[PDB]
């Protein structure tokens, strides 16, 4: 029985408790919770009722609709740091291509390295550099179904052009343009955060801001042929030297995803 | 029992149905097995009847070519898979269990010099290992002194002569064009790189970027044998860092009559 | 029971043997074990017998009279040990009270003024593992015991940093002692030329397999850090005795653990 089929399992336990099977999924990164109220008529799920998902350390997943889209949110994610590999982090993407979800929003608050970035403000994420997935902790690694995507995946357009404007557009529509940018996001393993030797580094590779998450996950969701979008909430500022509020950011965040999954429901069921 | 003691147990295993020991080894990497045609009076024996063998359709092939006796791996392992660097690197333990001396690695690989088209070959002259900087080196665990050096030196991984070989037999057989020199880069895979990440490979000096051979250098080195790897470079990035069979089967060709010519200049120095 | 409960209890069983509890720690690295025999009126106790941890020996002692712990001999990556693994002893010199440590190794020298012999006083590092999938600090993490997020702006105290530079001075070394930027890799073959070149890309100044872990860790114990390489060898621009080094470490160690007890 391989993850696949483990998340085909998962999934069809979580459908018996389903009227429609969600199409857009949400995953809601630090302190961004609230989006998950966001969802009207919810069945709530707590993670640790949830056959095979990995064991947290109290996360819940959300179904129920927002602007007329069935969604399925997740209140918390897993990382890295945490213990769990990189296929086990991201077992709950591939939950979700089980489940019949086609978008993937995701966020997560991260550390601003763009010398115009000031905490409080929003990152679209236009690509990634995913570094344990180039050493030695990638999320695909081990045996691959042939029927359920490619064993040599492109991660060319990871993160959807036009998800990404749809982005842009809502912030400047919501009247955060000055506050909202677009760039790279760097996944490092965490928990510590880096050296200042290390950061420059990361500055040297081209990232725009650093977390610890986001990138496996959208390596998986993407092959398993789904659209992805990530917004980072740059809560934090690394200075020139690289060395180194919620309450609005979640209202800002909650407001931004809404708008997007509304000019969303012209490109997907219902 | 150390992975040295088990690979002289399945090199031992082999032998018993083996007339000449081999003394030169080849790796066919991926739609280069053809190769192994070439190996003339050919026991053939399935990886899963080896004992020891990590499991994968990989076949070993015990031969002759231009009155060299050889040992033929018809298909690799790699970290992707879920086979930690040591074990799949397990297979170079046995060639040198073997008596193995010289071993030649090829692959399939995208190529990132802006001079390399799609169906060049590439000489590799260093490599670039990232997953073996970082938390899974093929030689990570107890070393057997007697073996070789608990901190082997990679400052000439690929024997310089062997090259030598390999470039005039590439000119010798029409290919100069078609062949060049340069450093490989090895990834885990089994997701291509982003953009992005493509651009820090290139920063970093990689002319082609594959998931393997890398590990297996470094642990043949280690065990006192001499290298030597080729590179088809199957698919070519762009600048901006971004049927089939009929490239394949002349790509074959041509490889395994390099390989052949290859193996004539060294049966002079054995 | 978390790593940091098991360090407690290693600890507690040591202490059933100590009169004073150490306030100094030290790490002896590649060679550098004679530092050890600095201590006075020290216990020994090899790590074989120790609970917990994984011919290398742990002495209490005391030196300029301050008590310390020290290790002669640590644990690396690349013997298989995970990185929480390799950096228990540093969450037992947390639980035994430790309040200092000052951590030695042998390095290369990638920075071109550097000499075989020279010592690199560490300022800052990269280390490679811990940013990809192997983290010392990979786990679940004890609030009460540090920070599941953990700063490393300053992994290296600059005071500790300036008692070393100025006791090499003071000892007439202050030509071959440097400070500057040490990397860790995982090990234990050392690196190609290319990769070398990379390292240098990365501002790295010594390339070495430990110490890195082992200061995240004691740095998110709230312990302070200063680390002091040896360089060994040196790596040519193409990218390609110990008994000396041992008396002039151990003479610097001493001089800076003298520096320390005055202080406050």
Redesign the interface.
């Known amino acids: 029985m391989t993850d696949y089929d483990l998340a085909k399992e998962t999934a069809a336990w979580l459908n018996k408790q389903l009227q429609i099977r969600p199409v857009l999924g949400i995953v809601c990164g630090s302190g961004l919770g609230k989006i998950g109220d966001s969802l009207e008529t919810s069945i709530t799920v707590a993670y640790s009722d949830i056959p095979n998902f990995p064991v947290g ?1 109290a996360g819940s997943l959300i179904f129920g609709s927002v602007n007329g889209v069935s969604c399925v949110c997740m209140k918390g994610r897993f990382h ?4 769990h590999t ?1 296929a086990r982090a991201t077992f709950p993407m591939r939950v979700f291509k089980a489940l019949g979800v086609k978008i993937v929003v995701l966020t997560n608050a991260a550390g601003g390295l763009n010398p115009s970035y000031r905490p409080g403000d929003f990152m679209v994420v236009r ?12 999320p ?5 179904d042939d029927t359920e995507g490619e ?6 357009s ?1 993160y959807d052009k036009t998800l990404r404007k749809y982005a842009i557009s809502a912030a400047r529509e919501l009247g955060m343009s000055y506050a909202t940018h677009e760039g ?1 996001y760097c996944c ?11 950061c ?2 990361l500055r ?3 990232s725009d801001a650093v977390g610890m998450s986001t990138a496996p996950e959208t ?1 998986v969701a993407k ?1 398993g042929g789904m659209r992805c979008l990530a917004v980072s909430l740059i809560s934090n500022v690394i200075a020139s030297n690289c ?2 509020a919620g309450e609005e950011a979640s209202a800002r965040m909650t407001a931004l995803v809404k708008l997007v999954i509304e000019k969303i429901r012209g490109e997907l069921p219902r």
Request: aromatic letters at 6%.
């Open positions: 350390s890295l740091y945490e213990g990189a690509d990634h550099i995913n570094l344990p997935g180039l050493a030695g902790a990638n695909l690694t081990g045996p691959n064993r040599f995946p492109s991660m060319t990871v790279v490092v393993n965490g928990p510590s955060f880096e050296t200042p030797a290390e420059k580094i040297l590779m081209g390596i092959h060395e180194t």
